[PDB]
Amino acid sequence: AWYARYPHILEEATRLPFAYPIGQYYDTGYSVASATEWSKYVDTSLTIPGVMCVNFTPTPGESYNKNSPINIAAQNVYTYVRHMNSGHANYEQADLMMYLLAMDSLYIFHSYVRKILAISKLYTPVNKYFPRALLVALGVDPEDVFANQAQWEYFVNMVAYRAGAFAAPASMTYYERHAWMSNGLYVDQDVTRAQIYMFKPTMLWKYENLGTTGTKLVPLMMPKAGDNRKLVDFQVLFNNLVSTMLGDEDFGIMSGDVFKAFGADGLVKLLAVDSTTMTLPTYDPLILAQIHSARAVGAPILETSTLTGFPGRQWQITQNPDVNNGAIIFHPSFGYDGQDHEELSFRAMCSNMILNLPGEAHSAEMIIEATRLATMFQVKAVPAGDTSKPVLYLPNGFGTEVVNDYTMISVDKATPHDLTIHTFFNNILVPNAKENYVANLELLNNIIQFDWAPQLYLTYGIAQESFGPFAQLNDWTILTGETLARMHEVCVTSMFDVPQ
Amino acid sequence: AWYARYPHILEEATRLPFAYPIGQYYDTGYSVASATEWSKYVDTSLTIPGVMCVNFTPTPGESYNKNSPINIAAQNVYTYVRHMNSGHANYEQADLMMYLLAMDSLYIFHSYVRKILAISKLYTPVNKYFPRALLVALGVDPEDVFANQAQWEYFVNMVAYRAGAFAAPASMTYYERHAWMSNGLYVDQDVTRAQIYMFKPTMLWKYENLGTTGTKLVPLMMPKAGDNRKLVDFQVLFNNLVSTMLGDEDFGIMSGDVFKAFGADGLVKLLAVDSTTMTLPTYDPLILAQIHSARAVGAPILETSTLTGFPGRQWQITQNPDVNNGAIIFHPSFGYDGQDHEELSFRAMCSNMILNLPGEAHSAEMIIEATRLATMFQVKAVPAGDTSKPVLYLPNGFGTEVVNDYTMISVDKATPHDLTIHTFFNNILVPNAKENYVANLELLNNIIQFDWAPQLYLTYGIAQESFGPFAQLNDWTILTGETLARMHEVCVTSMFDVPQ
Amino acid sequence: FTPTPGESYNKNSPINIAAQNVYTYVRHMNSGHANYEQADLMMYLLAMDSLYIFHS
């Protein structure tokens, strides 16, 4: 060949600088020097996004009866605590189970602040997003972690010490699943300049035992991305979390009874951190499998949230013993977008989802673990009133965690190329504006930069027509709501299961 | 360990049919029962495209004086023919070189009709685009191949017999590249229900021999995908391809000189076909690398094409002994969209290209072979007149072939779900209309269904702003005009050569 | 019951694919008469099916 005869000309001809370090703006330049008269018609910008954050919410699953897996697990752990290990008989099954859920929220908070501490020591020349973009996506000021890192470390250690006052079973996979999910960095590819997936809890459950009418886990809001929160705000959040937890007699005898039934080696163990413990991003395909099938349900509903025609639709877990035979009722109203309007794009999520999977042959565990974060709407919630500004949807069942939002961190194409935060569901609405089509195209390109990005459903407001899954398909199926509800029931039963 | 002690429920809960055969419309249905009142706001339509045809054009490599690599190769092959072996003095070097260029067009046409005949025997139940969609994308009537298979077979055999009468050197790797490109299907993911890439000539060079002005090569059009031409149109094309070529007495004199110079074994031989010669799709990442880094230049300019301010910009490989010292002359003008107006989206190609490659370490052969189909504009061609409706762009030296446009085949949105043909460049213009945005969105989704799809530069007419490369970048670099011209000179010289 | 060839609104239906395959086997491999298309042969085969259903 000619290439074998003259390899020197081929070598000197094709020496190009590869491996551009992502994290800053790049300008391609002009091939035509007279193209400056067409200013916006030539796109010389080139931005590579680096961080996608999955804003998740811990849930016990769908529950409207006593036949829910949460109530079955409550009855089983109550039998193991009292009827086999001599309990105190000052509480029911549901009080113990809501106490266990409060433990889950505590361990999620500890893994969250441990990830916040461990992220800030990551520095590399090939990625300029490390570690400021991850701290921006977590809603924490990076200067407050640069300046007082030792205070952050000792606060994390003190959280791990104070969380050991109560007890929780180690063999329950719910705790270790939430702690592993909330404390990981997951690259979308096995390359040195990959993109970071993340899991930030926006919801934490706060114990609210007031009155005789039963306990309740009220919502507690976590810092959203772009809010520069310091260590004092996280300490205030932690003290608000254990305000009604420590100093409670019922919680004290519950911790004593769990410490009696399960041994000292049978309880969970929060690991101590120090100055040499840092985490690196790992490649997890099973994380990408459930990230791909993740379906957003929108921002949660609080007591302060105003809804026209929807009163009392807050995301609370109730423990009223006078109604429903004292069941742990938790079924929320989805589709709320954070404010009081119609949110036309959420109608695109009313079709049956497409379960996409890598490879050709799929095991049962792969299909079950790929549908952990999926949620399909089933029936519209009937409003109590003649006028209704939003539209809410009741699901047919969800897993141990739902997805509310997503967060994109990428460099801006305009001066001075700082980080931009883009919050979006799977559904993206593009209304009548000349500045919204190019922004939506840039958001689409930034989404498809990631490998297993969730399947979007873009609604165009000027054509009154939405679009299906905007993702590349390899081996897919159509999932009905009944089969996904069955898989969610299996997942919630297996996660809350404890061995006796 | 709930999955271990209850494996039957885990096995039964995840029995899903995953191998969905592409090639038909799929209605996912409504997950919410009352979502049928939202009309097009719930998109329950899912289509997977199957055919991407890359429409190319053979070129000598932008000759503009005697110092071009094609003229140097003409001098080298003329010294090899007439100085090393006792030849004739009736023909010059440029006549022999353009005879060799016309032999490439004849071999491309033979491989074209051979692929038309060999495609129609492809059938698999998991891909319903076989073989009707490939025959639609190749521009033939699919029913005419099935109804007249015996007349189609001997036509290809007679084309091979009447094109094998002349000689062309097999040591020259121009023919062994073009014939290998023009036949054979190329899957994009090496799976069973993969997507097929193709290569079809948009045009071919028909030999016409004039008097003292020269033996200039002329354009000859080819049927596009929405034509459904029968066998007699291809017979007419083959008849006027060699109408003034087989009727020339001096043609065989220089044809036999190649035979006696290069021997009887170092010649290009055409493979005869029978009823069992069936081609199969193969996986080649070398083809996908140059498919991914490909840039469209537009439709060729003909003598019948009307251009305001561009009277003599027709694509012709001229050779006049009177002017330019008897050199082969070929400098086409790109940027022609087929109509007599300026294509607004062609301004987006004035930025520097992005060479994206898989993996981390790239050899020099991979870099020089990944830039074969790319073509970058350098400077606008000066119009001859006070007004000009289109805008044409002169290249900085193109490679051995140029991509005109692309043809994409997919099933229809509505009844009866027949094949639809989409013709688009690398630049897609979305004008301000009611229904163009969702058509552009489904075009984008169908393009990103393909794995190594070319990078699209979408220009929006409402915002008067275009966007950069719409492709997933993995390991990329910015290519300037000078480096790509340096690569293209090497890639032109490496094909037009003889190692003796 | 009613004998049917299946759903067919395109040329990608299995009835048309079987018609093309049996037409190729009849003509292009076994020297057919070229006075009819694939579909005429396939409708003739369906008429044979109705005849054998009547006999049974």
Name every chain C residue with its beta carbon within 8 A of the beta carbon of B412: none
Closest CA to A455 of A335, A334, A354, A352: A354
Any chains having at least 3 CB pairs less than 8 A from chain A are B
Nearest-Cα distance to chain B for A82, in Å, is 23
Tokens of B359: 């993996």
Here the tokens at position B148 are: 């007249």
Query: Residue with structure tokens 């607004």?
Result: B344
Asked if A8 has any chain B CB less than 8 Å from its own CB, the reply is: no
**Exposure string over B99-116, b if 16+ CB within 10 A, otherwise e:** bbbbbbbbbbbbbbbbbb
Please state, in angstroms and rounded to a whole number, the distance separating the CA atoms of residues A27 and B295.
Answer: 19
Is A423 exposed, middle or buried (CB count within 10 Å of its CB: 0-12, 13-18, 19+)?
middle
Q: Do A28 and B478 touch (CB under 8 A)?
A: yes
Half-sphere exposure of B7 (CA within 13 A, CB side): 3
DSSP symbol at A472: -
CB-defined contacts B:C, below 8 A: 24
Please report the DSSP string for B319-352 in residue order: E-SSSGGG-EE----B-B-SSSS--GGGGGGGBP
Report d(CA A396, CA A313) in Å as an integer. Answer: 17
Residues of B in contact with A479 (CB under 8 A): 16
Are C23 and C40 a contacting pair, CB within 8 Å?
A: no
**Which technique?**
cryo-EM
CA distances in angstroms from A54 to A138, A233, A339, listed in the order given: 10, 22, 20
Q: Evaluate the omega torsion of the peptide bond into residue B131 and state whether it is cis, within 30 degrees of 0.
A: yes
Report yes or no: A365 at the B interface, CB cutoff 8 Å.
Answer: yes
Q: Which residues have C-beta within 8 Å of that of residue C40, sequence separation ≥ 6?
A: none
**Contact A43/B470, CB-based, under 8 Å?**
no
Measure CB to CB from residue B43 to each of A40, A348, A434 and give the nearest one.
A348
The CA-based angle B179-B184-B190, given to 5 degrees, is 140
Rg of chain B over all Cα atoms, to the nearest angstrom: 25
Interface contact flag, B416 C10, Cβ < 8 Å: yes
Say which residue the tokens 């979408």 belong to.
Answer: B458
Please state, in angstroms and as integers, the Cα–Cα distance from residue A41 to each residue in A354, A435, B375, B437, following that order: 36, 14, 19, 18
Residue B378, classed as helix, strand or coil, is: strand
What is the dihedral angle through the alpha carbons of A40, A44, A48, A54, rounded to the nearest 10 degrees? 10
In this structure, the dihedral spanned by the alpha carbons of residues B267, B273, B276 and B282, taken in order and rounded to 10 degrees, is 50
How far is it, in rounded angstroms, from Cα A395 to Cα A402?
11
Closest CB from C10, C12, C28 relative to B149: C28
CA B427 from chain centre, in angstroms, equals 16
Is residue B58 within a helix (H) or strand (E), and if so which, with residue range?
strand B51-58
- Given a contact cutoff of 8 angstroms between Cβ atoms, the answer to whether B383 and B473 are in contact is no
The answer to whether A140 and A156 have CB atoms below 8 angstroms apart is no
Q: Residue A428 and residue A480: Cα distance in Å, rounded?
A: 23
Strands B318-319 and B419-424: unpaired
The runs of H, that is alpha helices, within B205-284 are 231-241, 249-262
Cα B130 from chain centroid (whole Å): 20
**Quick one: how far is CA A12 from the chain centroid?**
49
Which residues in B137-224 belong to E strands, given as ranges? 186-187, 196-201, 203-207, 217-221
Residue B385 tokens, joined:
């007149």
List all residues 6 or more positions away from C6 whose beta carbon is below 8 Å from its beta carbon: C13, C14, C15
CA atoms within 13 A on the CB side of A36: 3
d(C-alpha B469, C-alpha B370), whole Å: 17
On the CB side of A328, how many CA atoms lie within 13 Å of its CA?
Answer: 27
Give this entry's resolution in angstroms: 3.2
DSSP bridge pairs for A421: A409
Compute the residue count for chain A: 500
Nearest CA in chain A to B450: A472
Q: Is C8 on the interface with B (CB under 8 A)?
A: no
Instruction: Please classify residue A23 by burial: count the beta carbons closer than 10 Å to its beta carbon, then call 0-12 exposed, 13-18 middle and 19+ buried.
Output: buried
Strand A216-221's sheet: what is its strand order?
A203-207, A216-221, A317-318
